[PDB]
């Protein structure tokens, strides 16, 4: 089963961050998306009550202008400033995008489910410049749903320019909606570390409710902070309130050239870091990561992680979502499709493209590109791939995976009937090369890749 280095990189990247299934990552038990979600919702509390699942909620929120007391005992109340208000509304929107929640602002003396306010001092009346924020779970008790932030932190005052402030808003709102931190730890109680993490996926990579940096799981965000819910948070909040199936149901583009009107899904130039888990409820969608020069690894599989713009594990696709297309940058990239019909564009650089199942359309772009086939099921005659920009003598088609059942023999213009043979057939009228592969144990020739252009036997890796 000696397969090529290009196939191996697809195989390995497909298994990037495998989780659950009795695995042990970082010496800890590995949780599936769902085991992580159940852990995060372990309080079993939402605005609809206890152990109430899949039920929507219509909630109110309020920027407090004054208080009689803060439920924690902290003092020195300061109301939200204009920037905090704007960023908090963007955080609320990132939650209502993914779950069946509506948020309506109230003012004056009206009560609200979720409230926002800052503090500056402790119960003793001394300045507190050390703490960050906290929030209270839904309930009927005094202060339920309230969230509180330390105004002496610049990131809290300036959440639109200091990424941790925006993440903190999203985080705190999550707690105010009923989500819990993955591990039984909390600010003020001793000194927890990633060694105190229940499961391996207890990190910023999987949930912004984690206390542990994305580096603990081998992700690397280079000092940036994701502003919106991450993959496990999306599953968790959907478990409580139901998924929002009205969101971005058109053809949506994430990354460069984005049409999402969401800052966390948008890169306006190559210096912008992207950190997101995408929720998308319909249509034909594209990951456009074309503006980066880093070597990237882009995986369109539901639940999978990508290494985008020189970061690691910074992009993921939520459970329940199908993203169809991907565009690499000028780096040497790996693009891995899913079972849907995908359009993959490597861009410049020497890229490895793997369409997987479905009828995919592949553009290697400038550079020495490799189009990888791991199975006869990747390109059946009934749903064949197109490779639309193949460069004879430059690009490669990798069929080394077929060695597992016997290395393919290249034949010139006829099959022998013995199987494990591959042929290139030139349609001169249309300038199309049909790559036919006859697999052993198939009575008909069932694998076809159509190529817009010429190809040579020496371009085919067997």
């Amino acid at each position: 089963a000696n397969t090529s280095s290009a196939y191996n990189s697809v195989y390995d990247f497909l298994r990037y961050h495998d989780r659950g299934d009795g695995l042990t990552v970082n010496g800890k038990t590995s949780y599936s998306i769902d085991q992580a979600a159940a852990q995060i919702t372990r309080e079993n509390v939402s605005w609809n009550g206890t152990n109430v699942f899949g039920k929507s909620a219509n909630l109110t929120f309020k920027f407090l202008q004054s208080v009689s007391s803060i439920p924690s005992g902290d003092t020195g109340f300061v109301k939200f400033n204009a920037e905090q208000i704007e960023q908090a509304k963007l955080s609320l929107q990132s939650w209502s995008d993914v779950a069946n929640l509506t948020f309506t602002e109230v003012t004056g003396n009206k009560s609200a489910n979720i409230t926002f306010g800052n503090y500056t001092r402790d119960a003793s009346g001394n300045l507190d410049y050390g703490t960050q924020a906290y929030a209270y779970y839904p309930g009927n008790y005094q202060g339920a749903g309230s969230s509180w932030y330390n105004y002496n932190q610049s990131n809290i005052r300036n959440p639109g320019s200091e990424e941790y402030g925006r993440q903190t808003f999203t985080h705190e709102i999550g707690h105010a909606l009923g989500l819990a931190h993955p591990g039984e730890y909390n600010a003020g109680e001793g000194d927890p570390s990633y060694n105190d993490a229940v499961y391996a996926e207890d990190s910023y990579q999987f949930s912004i409710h984690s206390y542990w940096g994305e580096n603990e799981t081998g992700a690397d965000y280079n000092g940036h902070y994701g502003g919106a819910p991450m993959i496990d948070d999306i599953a968790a909040i959907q478990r409580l309130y139901g998924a929002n199936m009205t969101t971005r149901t058109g053809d949506s583009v994430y990354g460069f050239n984005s049409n999402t009107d969401r800052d966390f899904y948008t890169a306006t130039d190559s210096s912008k870091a992207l950190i997101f888990s995408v929720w998308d409820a319909g249509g034909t969608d594209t990951f456009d990561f074309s503006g980066y020069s880093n070597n990237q690894r882009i995986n369109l599989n539901e639940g999978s992680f990508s290494d985008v713009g020189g970061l690691k594990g910074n992009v993921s696709i939520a459970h329940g979502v199908t993203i169809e297309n991907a565009i690499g940058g000028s780096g040497n990239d790996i693009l891995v499709g899913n079972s849907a019909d995908n359009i993959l564009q490597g861009g410049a650089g020497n890229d490895v493209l793997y369409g997987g199942a479905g009828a995919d359309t592949l553009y290697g772009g400038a550079g020495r590109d490799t189009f990888v086939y791991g199975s006869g099921q990747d390109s059946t005659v009934a749903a064949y791939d197109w490779i639309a920009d193949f460069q004879k003598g430059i690009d490669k088609i990798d069929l080394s995976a077929f060695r597992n059942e016997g290395q393919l023999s290249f034949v010139q213009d006829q099959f022998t009937g013995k199987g494990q043979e591959v042929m290139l057939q030139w349609d001169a009228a249309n300038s199309i090369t049909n790559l036919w592969l006859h697999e052993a144990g198939h009575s008909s020739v069932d694998f076809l890749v159509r190529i817009v252009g010429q190809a040579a036997q020496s371009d085919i890796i067997v």
Partner: peptide
Amino acid sequence: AKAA
């Protein structure tokens, strides 16, 4: 219950 409070998460800090």
